[PDB]
Amino acid sequence: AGAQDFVPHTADLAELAAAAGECRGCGLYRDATQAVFGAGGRSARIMMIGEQPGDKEDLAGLPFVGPAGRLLDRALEAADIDRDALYVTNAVKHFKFTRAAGGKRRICKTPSRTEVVACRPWLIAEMTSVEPDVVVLLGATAAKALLGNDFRVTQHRGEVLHVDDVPGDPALVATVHPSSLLRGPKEERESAFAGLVDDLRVAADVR
Ligand code: SF4
């Protein structure tokens, strides 16, 4: 059942994170430095979920510490959301990567659907533990983990969604991943930043 047996029977986030350090639910634990669990407390009303820890996250032991995390910090501030009141995590908790000759960083490789399904028990334990009012899904992998493998982030922008098989029926808001707004023509990046702010504001408004 993937990571299921590695998940202990607790809602204590420090205990879950320690256990995630021992997970072998898929092959990704082998080459990753460490498991990167979510950060934040169980009082959090807003949960945010990216794809996976990237290069910086793999070594920091924390989510959203890179350029993508800093852009998200700028978006959250513009949306009047405090990052300390958020629970932030990723669909899979081990960095999947390769290197290219001459590169300046390790390159993220897309988790397969199998890896996403294997690791989802941790996501479920996190949601059980935090009981968020709203889940922001940042990018396609995270959105598909909860909304199904055919889901298209691009076709449901700014929509409050609810699926039946999700812990605590929280509202779900699927949006672009902060990494997508780092490059491109200035006017498209600025339009996209506004869209992300809008989606974050939709999520924060959820009753
Ligand atoms: S990615 Fe998830 S399921 Fe795979 S080894 Fe890491 S914690 Fe376990």
Author numbering: 2 to 208
Task: Share the article's original sentences.
Substitutions of His109 in MsmUdgX with Ser, Gly, Ala, Gln, Cys and Lys showed the loss of its covalent complex formation with DNA but gained canonical UDG activities. However, H109 substitutions by Gln or Lys, showed poor activity. Both Cys and Ala mutations of H109 showed intermediate Kcat/Km values. Further, the overlay of all the structures of UdgX H109 mutants showed that the overall structures are very well conserved with a Cα RMSD of ca 0.2 Å. As anticipated, we note a clear difference in the sizes of the active site cavities in the various mutants. When we arranged the mutants in the order of increasing cavity sizes (left), we noted that the canonical UDG activity of the mutants increased with their increasing cavity sizes to begin with and then with a further increase in the cavity size, the UDG activity declined (right). It suggested that the initial increase in UDG activity (H109K to H109Q to H109G) occurred because of the efficiency with which the water molecule could be localized to make a nucleophilic attack on the C1′ position. However, a further increase in the cavity size (H109S to H109C to H109A) perhaps destabilizes the bound water, thereby decreasing the UDG activity.
